[PDB]
Amino acid sequence: SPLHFVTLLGSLRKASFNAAVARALPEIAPEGIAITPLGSIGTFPHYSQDVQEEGFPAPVLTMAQQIATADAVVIVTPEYNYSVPGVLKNAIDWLSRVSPQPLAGKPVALVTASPGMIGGARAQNHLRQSLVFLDAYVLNRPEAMIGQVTGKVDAQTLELSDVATREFLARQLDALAALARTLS
Amino acid sequence: SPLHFVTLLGSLRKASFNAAVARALPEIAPEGIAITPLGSIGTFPHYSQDVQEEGFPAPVLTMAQQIATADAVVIVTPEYNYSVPGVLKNAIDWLSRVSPQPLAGKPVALVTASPGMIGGARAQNHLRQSLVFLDAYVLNRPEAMIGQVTGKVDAQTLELSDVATREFLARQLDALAALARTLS
Amino acid sequence: SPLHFVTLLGSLRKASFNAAVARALPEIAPEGIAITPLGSIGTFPHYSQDVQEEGFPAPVLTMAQQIATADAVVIVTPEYNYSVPGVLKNAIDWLSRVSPQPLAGKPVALVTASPGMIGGARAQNHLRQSLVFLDAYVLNRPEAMIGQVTGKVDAQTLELSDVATREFLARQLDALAALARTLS
Amino acid sequence: SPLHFVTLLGSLRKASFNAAVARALPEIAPEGIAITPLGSIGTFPHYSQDVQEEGFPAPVLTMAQQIATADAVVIVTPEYNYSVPGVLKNAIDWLSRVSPQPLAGKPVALVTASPGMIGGARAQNHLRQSLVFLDAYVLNRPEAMIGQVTGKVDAQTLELSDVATREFLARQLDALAALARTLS
Amino acid sequence: SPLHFVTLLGSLRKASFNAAVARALPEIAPEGIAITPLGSIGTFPHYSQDVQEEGFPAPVLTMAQQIATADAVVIVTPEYNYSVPGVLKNAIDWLSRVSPQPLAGKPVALVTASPGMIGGARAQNHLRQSLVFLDAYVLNRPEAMIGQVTGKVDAQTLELSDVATREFLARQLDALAALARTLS
Amino acid sequence: SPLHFVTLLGSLRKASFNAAVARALPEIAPEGIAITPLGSIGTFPHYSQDVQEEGFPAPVLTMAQQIATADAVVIVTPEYNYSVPGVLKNAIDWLSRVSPQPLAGKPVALVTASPGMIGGARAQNHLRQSLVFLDAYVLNRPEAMIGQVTGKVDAQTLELSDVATREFLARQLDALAALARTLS
Amino acid sequence: SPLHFVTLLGSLRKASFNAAVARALPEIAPEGIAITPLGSIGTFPHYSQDVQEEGFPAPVLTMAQQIATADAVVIVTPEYNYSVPGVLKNAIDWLSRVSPQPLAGKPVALVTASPGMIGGARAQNHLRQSLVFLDAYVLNRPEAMIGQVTGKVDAQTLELSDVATREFLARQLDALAALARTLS
Amino acid sequence: SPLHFVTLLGSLRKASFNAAVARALPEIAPEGIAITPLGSIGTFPHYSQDVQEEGFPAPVLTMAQQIATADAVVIVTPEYNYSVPGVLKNAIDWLSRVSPQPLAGKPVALVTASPGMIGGARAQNHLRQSLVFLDAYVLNRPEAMIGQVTGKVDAQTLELSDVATREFLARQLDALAALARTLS
Numbered sequence A, B, C, D, E, F, G, H: 001s002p003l004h005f006v007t008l009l010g011s012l013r014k015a016s017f018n019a020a021v022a023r024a025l026p027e028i029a030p031e032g033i034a035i036t037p038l039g040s041i042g043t044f045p046h047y048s049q050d051v052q053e054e055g056f057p058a059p060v061l062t063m064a065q066q067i068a069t070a071d072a073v074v075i076v077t078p079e080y081n082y083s084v085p086g087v088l089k090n091a092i093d094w095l096s097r098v099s100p101q102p103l104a105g106k107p108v109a110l111v112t113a114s115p116g117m118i119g120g121a122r123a124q125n126h127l128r129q130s131l132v133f134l135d136a137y138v139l140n141r142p143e144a145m146i147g148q149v150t151g152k153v154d155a156q157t158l159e160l161s162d163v164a165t166r167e168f169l170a171r172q173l174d175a176l177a178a179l180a181r182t183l184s
């Protein structure tokens, strides 16, 4: 029984280090697991109940259904101002309003990449808190906070080059897989 | 010593209860305090370093300047998914990248309104964490979590009518003024 | 498959509302679930590595083993100063140092009873954060924050009397059972 | 303008790295600032309202009075299980019940030391949350999380020798002094 | 005519302030100047003529070659015991024995970061003395001694944040480029 | 009082002229002075605070204790690139980090041998500067700079034969003894 | 037992900060120590061996004798062009040619004052090197480099007013006293 | 394109070996290079800011102008007390205060003569440190330390006779020429 994971990306910039990490996941994916990226969160309008009343934005409904059929979600995001990027939270806000809400019962792993050293622990904390409210099953272990990322992805070639980082992400995907199969 | 406060609104919908509360603040304001609304957070694009490199969106600079010259800020916002609305966080994210950063040293009070009963305590917690990182001085007391907001503003007429709520908010404004004058 | 749950109590006072709730759990327990109380957290000394080196206090080892053999744990606790009571956190600190650590992989539900309206949301938040680190599986839903408890447990008789509350707790226990069996 | 700060220590063990940091603060203190240690939190019994009715434990009243008369408090603590040590929280719980409550309006700085890399960020977050409730004024910047403390204090001799750490802490103490003088 | 500078780092610890400064140089570099880090000095064995007779260690030849193709070298190092760190001096010792010797005629700028007020000036003195022997052309002005570095790079995030320091360094790089072009 | 001197050797090579000088010292030594070599500096790893975090290398602690218990130290070293060899400096860097630091108050004599004519005068200068920081008492006179050392030790037999040098070294050892007894 | 210290001043201008420091020494002097100024270095002619043949200049023989009979010398001097002022070096040059040479075996403490931040570290270094040649015993610790001296002396009123500076110089004088007596 | 060099003499005595070396330079000078002596440093008064305020001494202004107009400077000096003669340093001190300062950007070569074996290496070191501060471009190679000078200049006739030394000095002037033209 092959697993299907989808990735949600929390940064919009082209040279995003988190995007590099996200793009690496399908090549890193251990046997039995296929991984594909979701559409951009940049296509969502700002959440507004008035907009919702008129109808859900198409990219929102598309993403929700993509999450619904997936075996798990991997969220890869930077940390802004000791919390989750507003753009990413905005995507979560829209998704949370869909019926049925696609994150309920969904296995989720969190990954954060940062040039520094804390590696996004606070964004992950806040993100987990929302995901508990949405009844998601967020992987406890191993925690994926990737520090000093600037020297772990190669400039010009966009790709995550750190071999140690790649192996770590593979172990996290395996644990996420185990969680998904346990909950099924 | 006359103070000028500005208000930041965390909801975009026309019938927003938090908008109703924000509009009451300038009439409610104790003497010696004038209060004006900031522009809408809905005019901001999603944060992206690429957009920033090209130049700060005009509404971002306008808001940063109004905050810089104000003596204090009142943030009035709902709670989405046990945290701050993505849209509001996105505005904070944009403001945080301005030089000089307008919230540094700024006295701030938080107000949350909810139809529910917790009344937005969780959004205020996460907001406070971000504001500390941005070196703002956020009012400790009194805390303003307005629950059961449905019966405190009259529908059709948009306005906050509950006299006890008004009197409480005036008193929070007093504490904010006192905090501002202490730090000056 | 009959399940056995144990209860961990976060308040030391005799007239504790949280104690009333904890005592109600074994009679409330649905068919197939038996519930027994752990020893008091008041018998633990303050955590100290110096004390630990000399040897683990007996009640710590006794509690750890009762948790290890249990199918799930229910923590019933008040909220002090927007967080977990120090005494309860102290018990968790001791448990976390036992090998093997008894909360790893353990299903846990959180319950808070309070005179207020927030009903211990902040304590449960902080507690969840610690339990995540300890690799516990904490029930997402339903959340058990019992507000206005003064009229829900009767004075003179010490016991939880509100029938609606009892029925709620039964359903939470049912959800905890389902989580435990899913993870088994 | 001579200031007096008191230090509250969150670890009980003899060889505590945080104790080593706390002992260094008075010699590190910039001109105009004297710093003295509070009594041990290990002398407090577990918080219980039943005990409180009988009377506040003497060491609790002694510490509350030293805090009340101090110009500021520096809390130095490790992080246990992604939060504040139970014993330390227990001390805060006791202090919070004294009248008048000694931390209200008190300038406070936080210091955490850890063998890891995070250096106690999570403990400081939870501590800040409690301190808001108690109306303390906790220093926003600079934040003192001392990671890899093992190579910063020399074993066998108990003392903080790392010159970079000392300079950082002195600058934090300068900022606390400024906060204290501003609020006075 | 685009220039390529390489950086030589004199400290081995991960949380090194000098490394933080070294990492900032390529983003700081004015247009027409690209800056890349050399390999670690930690891979060199201790210098020994006996080892040399057997053959030059690979990382030595690799570094010498990278220096050779570079238009200039920036040496970024702390000061140990009023002088140059032995590990760095050891790398210079190895390089000085390569034929042809890569630093002869090479433009060199020196940068030192330190907690003190001296800012690593003594290390720069001794370093200059060795470089004269190696016939390097070391920039006279501006001299870059970054004192009180603890308040100039952010703890937790590894990054050089002091804006005045960054511009000062950009100015040194301009002066280094000018020196290089004069000799070219 | 049979004084005990220890010798620290700055060259790692088998045929070292400085090693030849160091080995000559105990036979040159007047009655009442025993001279023994310290362990090799080649056994030290490169200094790193990260390595220190995990623990001081055993040979570092051994050398520190032997220096600490010795009545005086004789440092015998070549000069590399107008300064002290990196390997030797690396050993000093490690010793300086030991508590208590073994060179404090320690009588020290410097001996340098070189094929050239300067005879290691520049190395002694830099070494003295470090030794000032480490609070050592280094012998002013007589200064032992052995130039043209190739013709002062006989090939094939490794031994220091130049009668003028031996007599000179003997007088230096006497002065070192006199200094040691004076400081007692 | 009574000590007599003499001060040698390295600056000739009336509003000299070092002159201010020099005048403070006899009142700052701890008990058992009297401090008197030497004559001015400005009365010495430029050194010349031809002039020396005719006879040593009178102020030189006078200074040499005052130093010889003194228990220790305190040299207070600015730093010129990263080194010792030529005038002061000239006075040293003259003293060095006297028989017997007055600085041999003499305890010396160095003090430098500067409006800047380095505070004369480079001058003290060069001075030390010369004094080694002259067999002086120069105090290793504490080092007295007084930076930002402009606010440490009150202008127009001539005298050193910074209390922290006075106490520090007092401590150096104590160490100089201890050094002299050990060597006795 | 003919170059003009000026010579600065560091000894005042009639029979100075360094003077003999200085006088030989114009005859040794290769075609395309003419060399003239500066005025004597003995005509300078001791540096004093009080004197400077009244006006720069005539010889200072004269020497500054000749250095400013020269293509390079050759400094010929003995070494006193392991450093530069005070009188020479005094001339430099005076020059350093003129605007514009004449040594800035000036190519400089150093020549030292001594009867010993070190050959003035220490004076050249210290001289270089000051000249770097004054932004001079000091020749790295070849280095001219004329040791064993007594038999290299003949008494009775005042002249520098050592043919190898003369050739060495000729090569240095060419290197000095090449340096000057590179910087032009």
Ligand SMILES: Cc1cc2nc3c(=O)[nH]c(=O)nc-3n(C[C@H](O)[C@H](O)[C@H](O)COP(=O)(O)O)c2cc1C
Residues within 6 Å of the ligand: A011, A012, A013, A015, A016, A017, A018, A019, A077, A078, A079, A080, A081, A082, A083, A113, A114, A115, A116, A118, A119, A120, B049, B093, B094, B096, B097, B133, E157
């Ligand atoms: C508005 C904003 C807020 C940020 N806040 C933090 C923060 O709190 N902690 C941190 O380590 N980095 C913070 N960063 C830096 C990001 O971690 C860094 O820019 C990262 O590379 C962004 O992720 P990306 O490369 O995938 O776009 C912030 C950046 C921005 C633009």
Ligand SMILES: Cc1cc2nc3c(=O)[nH]c(=O)nc-3n(C[C@H](O)[C@H](O)[C@H](O)COP(=O)(O)O)c2cc1C
Residues within 6 Å of the ligand: E049, E093, E094, E096, E097, E133, F011, F012, F013, F015, F016, F017, F018, F019, F077, F078, F079, F080, F081, F082, F083, F113, F114, F115, F116, F117, F118, F119, F120
């Ligand atoms: C990298 C290196 C740098 C050196 N630098 C100098 C120097 O600056 N001055 C000098 O007189 N000799 C210098 N030497 C020569 C050494 O003094 C010579 O190799 C001596 O024999 C080394 O001491 P040893 O025989 O005990 O190994 C240098 C040698 C090496 C390998």
Ligand SMILES: Cc1cc2nc3c(=O)[nH]c(=O)nc-3n(C[C@H](O)[C@H](O)[C@H](O)COP(=O)(O)O)c2cc1C
Residues within 6 Å of the ligand: G011, G012, G013, G015, G016, G017, G018, G019, G077, G078, G079, G080, G081, G082, G083, G113, G114, G115, G116, G117, G118, G119, G120, H049, H093, H094, H096, H097, H133
């Ligand atoms: C020729 C000259 C060179 C100087 N060089 C330096 C220097 O290298 N570094 C420094 O910090 N100050 C330098 N100074 C400034 C002195 O510190 C200044 O004279 C100071 O006021 C101390 O001298 P005073 O005792 O006369 O006050 C120099 C001043 C002069 C006149």
